Amino acid sequence: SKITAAPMVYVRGEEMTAYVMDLIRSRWIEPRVDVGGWETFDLRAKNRDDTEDRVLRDVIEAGKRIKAIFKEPTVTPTADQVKRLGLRKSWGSPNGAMRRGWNGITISRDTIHIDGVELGYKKPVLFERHAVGGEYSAGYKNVGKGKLTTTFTPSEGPDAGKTVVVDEREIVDEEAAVVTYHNPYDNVHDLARFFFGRCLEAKVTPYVVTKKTVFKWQEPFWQIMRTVFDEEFKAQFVAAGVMKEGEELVHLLSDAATMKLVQWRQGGFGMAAHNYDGDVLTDELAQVHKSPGFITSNLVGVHEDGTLIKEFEASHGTVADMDEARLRGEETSLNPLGMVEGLIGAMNHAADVHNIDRDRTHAFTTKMRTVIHQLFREGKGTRDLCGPSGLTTEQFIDAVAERLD
């Protein structure tokens, strides 16, 4: 019989990556898997506009309920896409809605590896980008001269109801930005446990990255991480052979971390950072490793009941330049590994959360990865890695289908 897929959210996009995933689902998944449990959504930019973003709200509900989401690369309906695709209004990135809706802890941005193919980092690197806070949720104005004041009124504790001044300053420029944001740090306890748990299992040395020497409000990010590490993990990292006895958890300034990403070509490390530092440093990570497609973008949140909500995504876009070449009838070569890693992660997590056909699902997802890697080893991978004698998009997809059983 076919494998019974556990409940999972599937978010379809458009252009080259949707064409490729249509093929993968029809030729790899569907012959071997009953996908009745998959709740599919059309997140075309046109469909987000056509539905007034009801589809995005349905995605968020489904994700809370099901706990496991695969999302394809999607076209954010920016002002430029309104012009091109002929939309009625512009819509922001869906990332904010997912990160708030699923109580986001981290975006895991890990290097993707192929056994037998050398990429930039020799051994796995793990990266946690704190999923919330910082300038991504700032309030701001662009102003001239005047008086800026920031007040805070606690709602509990000894000084509940008493307003204090956080900051007061005089703007003396005709043009200035004024900006306020917050970092919520309660979930850094969860982040730390998630990060250090991962790093231990991977046997990689963990590092915490901030600008806390100068941006002193970040100190709790470090302190929370170090406390969890010392109390709950340090002896375990010693016993795993990862760190020497007496070796303390290392703090890296963001300034240093940017240098270490270029230097540490052997890999075998983990970093955790705030939202913006994570955004920047993981794109650097992508470039050093190979390209955006070879780093994960795995959002990890938590339901109110304590079950982890995991969404998985490739880190490249929809690849319109290649899609246009397809409709002109020219040969394409899209590497589907990024998206497949995400689908694997989503299918695996769905199987674990719901305990539906768990053994057979892990065996099948493992088999997909193994077959993919073996083809790359054999010189039958896509042209990004195997050169001009590498396979086209369709040849690669058919090659895997023939190998799968």
Ligand X SMILES: NC(=O)c1ccc[n+]([C@@H]2O[C@H](COP(=O)([O-])OP(=O)(O)OC[C@H]3O[C@@H](n4cnc5c(N)ncnc54)[C@H](O)[C@@H]3O)[C@@H](O)[C@H]2O)c1
Going by the annotation, the residues of the binding site for Mg(2+) are 255, 279, 283
Q: With CB under 6 A as the rule, give the number of residues binding ligand X.
A: 11
Contacts of 117 (CB under 8 A, 6+ apart): 373, 376, 377, 381, 385
Site string for Mg ion, 243-282 (x = CB under 5 A): ------------x-----------------------x---
> Is 132 a binder of ligand X (CB under 6 A)?
no
Radius of gyration of the chain (CA): 23
Considering only residues 280 to 309 of the shown chain, the ones binding a second copy according to CB under 8 A are 280-281, 283-284, 286-288
Which of 1, 86, 216, 355 is in the footprint of a second copy by CB under 8 A?
216
Question: Where do we find the tokens 């650097």?
Answer: 284
> Is 317 a binder of ligand X (CB under 6 A)?
yes
Using alpha carbons, select from 373, 343, 375 the residue that is nearest to residue 361.
343
Report, in Å, the least distance between residue 284 CB and a second copy. Answer: 4
CA distance linking residue 52 with residue 36, whole number of Å: 27
Which of 259, 265, 307, 324 is in the footprint of a second copy by CB under 8 A?
259
Discontinuities in the chain (C→N > 2.5 Å), after residue: none
CA distance linking residue 134 with residue 306, whole number of Å: 25
Report, in Å, the least distance between residue 169 CB and a second copy. Answer: 6
C-alpha 184: how far from its chain's center?
19
> Is 279 a binder of a second copy (CB under 8 A)?
yes
Report, in Å, the least distance between residue 75 CB and Mg ion. Answer: 19
> Is 381 a binder of ligand X (CB under 6 A)?
no
Considering only residues 376 to 405 of the shown chain, the ones binding a second copy according to CB under 8 A are none
Binding at 312: pick from ligand X, a second copy, Mg ion, none (beta carbon under 5-8 Å per type): none
Could you give the 3-state DSSP secondary structure of residue 392?
coil
Which of 293, 301, 342, 390 is in the footprint of ligand X by CB under 6 A?
293
Site string for ligand X, 334-363 (x = CB under 6 A): xx--x-------------------------
Which of 70, 185, 364, 396 is in the footprint of a second copy by CB under 8 A?
185
Element (H, E) at 141: strand 139-143
Task: Determine the Cα angle at 320 with ends 316 and 322, to 5°.
Answer: 95
Using alpha carbons, select from 386, 268, 253, 383 the residue that is nearest to residue 330.
383
Output 91 or 136, the one with its CB closest to a second copy: 136
Question: Where do we find the tokens 């290097």?
Answer: 111
Beta strand pairing call for 38-42 and 106-108: unpaired
Binding at 181: pick from ligand X, a second copy, Mg ion, none (beta carbon under 5-8 Å per type): a second copy
| DSSP conformation letters of 67-90 | -EEEE-------HHHHHHHT-SS-
Q: Which stretch binds ligand X (CB under 6 A): 108-116, 193-201, 220-228, 333-341?
A: 333-341
Binding at 195: pick from ligand X, Mg ion, a second copy, none (beta carbon under 5-8 Å per type): none
5, 347 contact by CB (below 8 A):
yes
Considering only residues 111 to 140 of the shown chain, the ones binding a second copy according to CB under 8 A are 133, 135-136, 138-140
> Is 159 a binder of Mg ion (CB under 5 A)?
no
144, 173 contact by CB (below 8 A):
yes
> Is 256 a binder of a second copy (CB under 8 A)?
yes
CA distance linking residue 60 with residue 99, whole number of Å: 10
Considering only residues 79 to 108 of the shown chain, the ones binding ligand X according to CB under 6 A are none
> Is 322 a binder of a second copy (CB under 8 A)?
no
> Is 135 a binder of Mg ion (CB under 5 A)?
no
> Is 325 a binder of ligand X (CB under 6 A)?
no
372, 339 contact by CB (below 8 A):
no
